[PDB]
Amino acid sequence: SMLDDAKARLRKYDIGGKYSHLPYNKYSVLLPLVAKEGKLHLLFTVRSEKLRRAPGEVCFPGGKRDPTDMDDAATALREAQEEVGLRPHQVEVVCCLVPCLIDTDTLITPFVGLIDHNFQAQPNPAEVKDVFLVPLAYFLHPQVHDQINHIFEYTNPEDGVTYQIKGMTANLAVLVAFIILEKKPT
Numbered sequence: 001s002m003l004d005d006a007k008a009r010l011r012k013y014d015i016g017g018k019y020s021h022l023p024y025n026k027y028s029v030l031l032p033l034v035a036k037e038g039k040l041h042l043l044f045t046v047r048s049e050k051l052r053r054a055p056g057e058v059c060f061p062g063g064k065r066d067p068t069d070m071d072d073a074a075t076a077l078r079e080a081q082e083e084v085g086l087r088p089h090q091v092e093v094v095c096c097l098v099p100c101l102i103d104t105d106t107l108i109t110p111f112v113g114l115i116d117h118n119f120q121a122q123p124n125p126a127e128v129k130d131v132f133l134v135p136l137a138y139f140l141h142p143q144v145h146d147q148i149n150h151i152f153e154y155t156n157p158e159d160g161v162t163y164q165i166k167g168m169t170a171n172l173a174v175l176v177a178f179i180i181l182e183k184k185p186t
């Protein structure tokens with residue numbers, strides 16, 4: 001099936017806990033895959049203008065590991081619950097992708113999660129200004145604007161609202177699209 005095929009592809013790229021004990025400042029992100037209208041989508045947040053890190057930016061759900069977290073996947077799931085109301089029973093963590101090194105002392109670990117079809121986001125306005133889906137296939141043929149660095153513009157056909165996706169967030173979205181969608185019969 002579509003979902004079984006996605007998880008099987010993703011598992012081939014799982015690094016697991018190989019980099020997880022290294023002594024960095026540690027953050028995790030959740031890359032949430034949602035099946036709608038017979039296609040896979042990624043779920044994105046727009047961060048509230050209030051925040052420390054990256055006010056008003058498009059980001060995946062995530063944040064800093066705390067002492068309660070059993071592991072880096074727990075961090076991603078805790079933060080996703082706080083931001084959008086995603087509960088544990090509503091997500092299956094499929095794999096851990098290549099981590100992202102930043103600022104010489106920080107390591108951000110991304111986890112891909114399959115999201116239950118009955119989940120409905122409840123944006124927490126202290127954390128997130130907006131939540132939106134993008135079809136995964138978009139990232140194979142994005143609308144690119146050079147700002148010199150590349151920026152994706154996605155317009156939601158439901159309402160005509162345009163979002164800018166950039167940086168680590170854009171990079172990870174492309175990676176997931178390649179992993180899941182490359183070399184598929186029509």
Ligand SMILES: O=C1CC=CN1c1ccccc1-c1ccc(F)cc1
Pocket residue numbers: 027028029053054059060061062063064102106108167168169
């Ligand atoms: O500012 C950005 C842009 C993308 C990753 N960062 C970071 C830069 C440094 C430390 C942490 C983050 C981070 C931000 C949001 C999040 F959900 C998880 C990690």
